[PDB]
Amino acid sequence: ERTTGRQAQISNITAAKAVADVIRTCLGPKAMLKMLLDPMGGLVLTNDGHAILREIDVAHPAAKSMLELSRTQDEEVGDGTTTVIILAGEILAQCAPYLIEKNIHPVIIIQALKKALTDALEVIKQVSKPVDVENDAAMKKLIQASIGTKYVIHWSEKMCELALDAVKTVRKDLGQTVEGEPNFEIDIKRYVRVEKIPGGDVLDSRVLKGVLLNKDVVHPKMSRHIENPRVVLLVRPTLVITEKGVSDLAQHYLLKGGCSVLRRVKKSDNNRIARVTGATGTNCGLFKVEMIGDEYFSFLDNCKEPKACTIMLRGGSKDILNEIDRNLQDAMAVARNVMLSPSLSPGGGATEMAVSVKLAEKAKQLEGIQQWPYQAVADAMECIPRTLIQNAGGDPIRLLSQLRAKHAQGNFTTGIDGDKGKIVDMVSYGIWEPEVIKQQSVKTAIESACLLLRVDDIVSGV
Amino acid sequence: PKAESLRRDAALKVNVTSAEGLQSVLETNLGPKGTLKMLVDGAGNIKLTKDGKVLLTEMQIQSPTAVLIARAAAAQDEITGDGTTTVVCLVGELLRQAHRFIQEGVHPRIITDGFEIARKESMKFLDEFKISKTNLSNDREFLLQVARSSLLTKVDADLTEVLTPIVTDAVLSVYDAQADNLDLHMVEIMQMQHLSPKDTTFIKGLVLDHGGRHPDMPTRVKNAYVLILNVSLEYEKTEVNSGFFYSSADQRDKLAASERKFVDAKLKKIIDLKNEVCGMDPDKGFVIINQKGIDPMSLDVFAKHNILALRRAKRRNMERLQLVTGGEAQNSVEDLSPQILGFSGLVYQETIGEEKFTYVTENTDPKSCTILIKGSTHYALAQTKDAVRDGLRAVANVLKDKNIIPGAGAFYIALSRYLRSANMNKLGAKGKTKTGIEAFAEALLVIPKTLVKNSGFDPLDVLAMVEDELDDAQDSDETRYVGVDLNIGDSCDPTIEGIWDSYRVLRNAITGATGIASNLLLCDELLRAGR
Amino acid sequence: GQIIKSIAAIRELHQMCLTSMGPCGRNKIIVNHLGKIIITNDAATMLRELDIVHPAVKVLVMATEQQKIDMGDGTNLVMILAGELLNVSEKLISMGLSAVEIIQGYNMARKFTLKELDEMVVGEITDKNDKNELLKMIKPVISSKKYGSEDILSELVSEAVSHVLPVAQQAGEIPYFNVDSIRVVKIMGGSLSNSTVIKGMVFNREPEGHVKSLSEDKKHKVAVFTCPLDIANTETKGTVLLHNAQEMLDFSKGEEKQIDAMMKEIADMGVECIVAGAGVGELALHYLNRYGILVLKVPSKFELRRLCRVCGATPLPRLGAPTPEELGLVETVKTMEIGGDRVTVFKQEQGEISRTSTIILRGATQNNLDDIERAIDDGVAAVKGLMKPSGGKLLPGAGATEIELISRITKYGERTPGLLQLAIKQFAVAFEVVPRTLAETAGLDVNEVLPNLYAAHNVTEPGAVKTDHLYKGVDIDGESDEGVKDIREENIYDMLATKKFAINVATEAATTVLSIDQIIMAKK
């Protein structure tokens, strides 16, 4: 019913820790598969953490809050879902003796995690290296990490070009000190939403800026090329577009007015038309209705970059385009992180080790009550690369101490390799990860870990 | 303060232990010396099948580990169609050989990655070990011994000599010589009881269910014309609504015969076709299919002209009769043409009170076959049908793929010897890889030990005679294949004995059993959720 | 997981010792099966009265007895430190670090600590044996045991030590101070302010005679007679019996003339004191009253050993042979009333310097009476630690030693590469239990006093030479304060011989527990 005293703080830690300890094997390319027992004869053979956590029944409400965090993290970026859950669960494990045995007030721990969150972001920015976002050949290699070892490996040459133009279409580079930093206003969900059309070719597939409709002209004889077409949503306009259907009586009335009637338009697509037009249609680029792939199309595009559109996907069949959907969306999440800042971070756990080394040295100069929980954070930052060591077959005791000693001498970009299993450099061997995932993994894990410690009693009632 | 290294071992051991129980069950029935398993639901369903995939579909297993084992054979039956039990034996035995290595502290990733490296190296040695066979049709004598590999497994070997010419002549008769392919859907299997299984014979044409019943019907008709009749010969009524009004019973026959004149008018044009073309010529016949029913009045009319009367034919079986006979379907009698008649040979009908079958056999270009499996008991029908369907699919990959591999554990023993000496010469993978290759090499030697274990001969003596013979063949500068002879107990030459396995069957067996068995050891913990 | 449960069994007894060291410590009442209550504040003596079941605790008990036998002080530092080494090693065992490198890490950290003990010496004891100089060593010994008595008991203990020590300097060949030279006696009544210091043993029994005390003459002769007072007869049997009334007059007068003849020869030799270890007859006390001989009976043989080292007397196996060579000499003996009852004490004046002294305790509390008796015994061994093995060197106490070692050990952790860094870092963290124990038992907040201790020894000084105050230890407060204060104000220091010996014993104590992965026992 209700849990008071110090026993409630233990139940809050073990709730999110029991879930994070099981998914420890889901991290890295060497991640081991998992097997769940359903009441039905089927089972889940995949190692994806997002699919497994949704099928696990939980009791304590702290585990339910960790499930909602994985859903938000999965929408921002494609991978790194299990990294946030494990990092948020290990912090509570290292702070367990301090909160219970040492009898340290929880707000002191919460206030220390907020101070360590700022210091953790400054270290990652120093370890990161500059990268050119305008190079078309460099962006294809950054996306290639999410391309290869997948069914798209045969089209990988065409996929890197298709994913490149898909990101370049939604992004626009604008900045100044007058109106501030717009941050490019990039949204994958609404603006980058794709429509799969059967037939065509993947190489010939292009990204058109606008809304694509399959409805053709309602009159047999009409001009298929308009100089300055004007889109009107519902002055003597050059075009008439209706959301619902249009009877044949209105065809002859608007025929003498020099405008085309277009019916059967979806409501969700009307919001994207306002970006290429502004109607609550002058300077419209191409009116060509020419049929492509035995299906009548329409071109709403123009000479401007509204940062809104519908990507037209074409391929050999519908089954091929279905796998491209989830593969292209996960590939653009890495390219979107490159445009958020011209910096890259070393993978394989090198970024996780770079924060723990600089945190222990800086915490000794503060000389305050917050110094003790900083050592628990540095130990939690080292568990992420150590988890990959346990899955790589190497000695977790030896490889952890030898890697930490190399940071005091060498650089912070030296991680752990999954294929080999020995300490190697990430930059020279071509292992890279974006910094935005590292920023979202540390920030969301600390913010979620503080909320779990703020509840000292479980209230039962409706 | 909880950090546990106790997560090293988990229910994965039970996952391996649960696979050990399934191995001991399917170890006894593997091979021609195996045993015939029987499952009973309790409602009267009794099926006797030695195949592993067929039995696992009727048994529910709560352990999720054995679920993927049954699902691994789903791609084997739909492609290879043979070796479902052998794949299971390779998955279970590989877990036992790796059990000793897990307790020593070996990480399962090296064990898993070591199997994929040995699998890729096995494909290189597989191309050199295989033998390419020509597509010429003179290999039928060689295909007789190859087809016995699948036949001797599911039976006691007494019925193998009877089913050998039936399976061989079924595919080769309808298959012209080219790349092309073969279709087993055109071969229909029917069953009838109250007979012995040794009476099974080959059928060139199609077997019909309902036969004609009349004492004066001709028993044997040679060189008869098949004619599809789509009109109903049963009782008919006036096209407009009316009624029968009669004061006496004698007046009823006048109104009843008025509606019967529609059928008798069409029968006059049918009997004229027989006498028009080769009416008085000897060795001639006229047979009416008549998928629809037959009125009792036409029984005496068709008997005087020696015309075979048939009724109630399956709609699916009518599509094959158009290909075998060649005659087109004739809907109307007025539109009947003499070119509609097809061609057929001697047609004899066996007289049995329960059922009567019509033989469409002895045709120039039938382009179809029928395998009739008849037995008195219930298990005799299911056991023989399992050997025929497994035999047709085993030979299916023999004619398509020009490569053939010797069976009886020839490739399993040879591959284990090649991978053993090749690992020390290369040493390009890793020093810890030897644990995965040695476990994979020893896991392939269970198949020759399983076959000899059911025969009663000492598996230790047959293992030493094969290894000592292969060493003497290398120093003699020649190529000699060695195999396990189950009857005598010593080695044997697989080329002389005639034991051969398809290339695609053993290729997906080693590759399929490697990925499934490796994924089993990858499970860290068994979670129960969703209820 | 038996090695983890073994630490939990010690953890149950670990919290008992956490409330022992420090001013909050209290004695424990233990009722023996024989109906006797022994009350002592000392932990080493407490372990003797407690029955230990698990043999894993016996390893710590045997290591605790080593501290009491040799140095006699620091038993609380050995048990508490050894118990914390198992707690910090529990995280390393659960982390997956083998106990082999954990044991090897302590051997490397122990050698680094012993080499730094010579550079941490602040003052040097000149061994002057002055009354004011001994106040610095005795004060921390009485401290953390009984509160309020540290000022009064400091002058009583330091005065008795200077009486038994001769005048010498820079000579370590011949030992002088023993552990039996200081005896503690108790009597009902009085107070701590009225207590005095006696230069010799104190006898609380009655003289059993009409002579209360001897005269003021110099060099009184004292003779110890082990043979009882009676007429000389056959050693075998020799029971006096009366067959008839005729022999009664000869046997009665014979015993009177024989005893009087022996006492006359002894009185002529100048012996005014006769010590009879056995019983004394009725007729023997009549002659000793007229000759003015003090009657003293010491049945205990343990008290006669220390008496021979003072006056020089020797026990005689016979009676009636006053050999002047073996007789003792005492300057002055007096009988005065101390504690409400008249008793005959033993002291000196100038010559025949006594090597054994006794401090008389007075008080109205029975519980605190035995507390000081057991507390002085811990201070007796502190004087023994002034000898050649690092007797003059001293280190600052009051938690300042364990905190200062944290910065020195962690500096050498990153210097030594390899897996040894895990055991070196945890070895310095285990020293944090000492400052936390004094702050927790005294009611001080952990969020306040503890962070001020780390900032005291760690400061930013623009230069290589250390400055400001490195002497700040753990403060008990008791009135008011802000942060901590300097320990040099109260002059509380710890000897090097006590601290260095406690580290080697505590290191081998936790080494035995971590090395044992299996325990096999059977019922008795």
From Swiss-Prot, chain A:
Disulfide bonds: 303-309
Pfam families reported in the protein's UniProt record: Cpn60_TCP1 (PF00118)
Protein name per UniProt: T-complex protein 1 subunit gamma
Protein purpose: Molecular chaperone; assists the folding of proteins upon ATP hydrolysis. Known to play a role, in vitro, in the folding of actin and tubulin. In yeast may play a role in mitotic spindle formation.
Keywords assigned: Acetylation, ATP-binding, Chaperone, Cytoplasm, Disulfide bond, Nucleotide-binding, Phosphoprotein
Localization annotation: Cytoplasm
Record's keyword annotation contains Chaperone: yes
Molecular function per GO: ATP binding; ATP hydrolysis activity; ATP-dependent protein folding chaperone; unfolded protein binding
Assembly and interaction partners: Heterooligomeric complex of about 850 to 900 kDa that forms two stacked rings, 12 to 16 nm in diameter.
Keyword rRNA processing: no
Family of the protein in this entry: Belongs to the TCP-1 chaperonin family.
CDD domains assigned to the protein according to its UniProt record, in alphabetical order: TCP1_gamma
The organism's taxonomic lineage, starting at the top: Eukaryota, Fungi, Dikarya, Ascomycota, Saccharomycotina
InterPro entries: Chap_CCT_gamma, Chaperone_TCP-1, Chaperonin_TCP-1_CS, Cpn60/GroEL/TCP-1, GroEL-like_apical_dom_sf, GROEL-like_equatorial_sf, TCP-1-like_intermed_sf, TCP-1_chaperonin
One GO BP annotation of this record: protein folding
The organism of origin for this protein: Saccharomyces cerevisiae (strain ATCC 204508 / S288c) (Baker's yeast)
GO cellular component entries: chaperonin-containing T-complex
From Swiss-Prot, chain B:
Subunit structure: Heterooligomeric complex of about 850 to 900 kDa that forms two stacked rings, 12 to 16 nm in diameter.
Pfam families: Cpn60_TCP1 (PF00118)
Entry GO CC: chaperonin-containing T-complex
Primary site of residence: cytoplasm
Tagged with keyword Phosphoprotein: yes
Domain of life (superkingdom): Eukaryota
Residue(s) carrying Phosphoserine: 242
Biological classification of the source: Eukaryota, Fungi, Dikarya, Ascomycota, Saccharomycotina
Family membership: Belongs to the TCP-1 chaperonin family.
Function: Molecular chaperone; assists the folding of proteins upon ATP hydrolysis. Known to play a role, in vitro, in the folding of actin and tubulin. In yeast may play a role in mitotic spindle formation.
UniProt KW keywords: Acetylation, ATP-binding, Chaperone, Cytoplasm, Nucleotide-binding, Phosphoprotein
GO terms for MF: ATP binding; ATP hydrolysis activity; ATP-dependent protein folding chaperone; unfolded protein binding
Protein known as: T-complex protein 1 subunit zeta
Cellular compartments annotated: Cytoplasm
GO annotation terms (biological process): chaperone mediated protein folding independent of cofactor; protein folding
Swiss-Prot record, chain C:
Record function comment: Molecular chaperone; assists the folding of proteins upon ATP hydrolysis. Known to play a role, in vitro, in the folding of actin and tubulin. In yeast may play a role in mitotic spindle formation.
Cellular-component GO terms for this entry: chaperonin-containing T-complex; cytoplasm
One GO MF term attached to the UniProt entry: ATP-dependent protein folding chaperone
GO BP terms, alphabetized: chaperone mediated protein folding independent of cofactor; protein folding
Keyword Phosphoprotein part of the UniProt annotation: yes
Top-level taxon in the UniProt lineage: Eukaryota
InterPro entries the UniProt entry points to: Chap_CCT_theta, Chaperone_TCP-1, Chaperonin_TCP-1_CS, Cpn60/GroEL/TCP-1, GroEL-like_apical_dom_sf, GROEL-like_equatorial_sf, TCP-1-like_intermed_sf
Presence of keyword ATP-binding: yes
Subcellular location, record wording: Cytoplasm
Family of the protein in this entry: Belongs to the TCP-1 chaperonin family.
Matching Pfam families: Cpn60_TCP1 (PF00118)
Gene: CCT8
Protein name: T-complex protein 1 subunit theta
UniProt subunit comment: Heterooligomeric complex of about 850 to 900 kDa that forms two stacked rings, 12 to 16 nm in diameter.
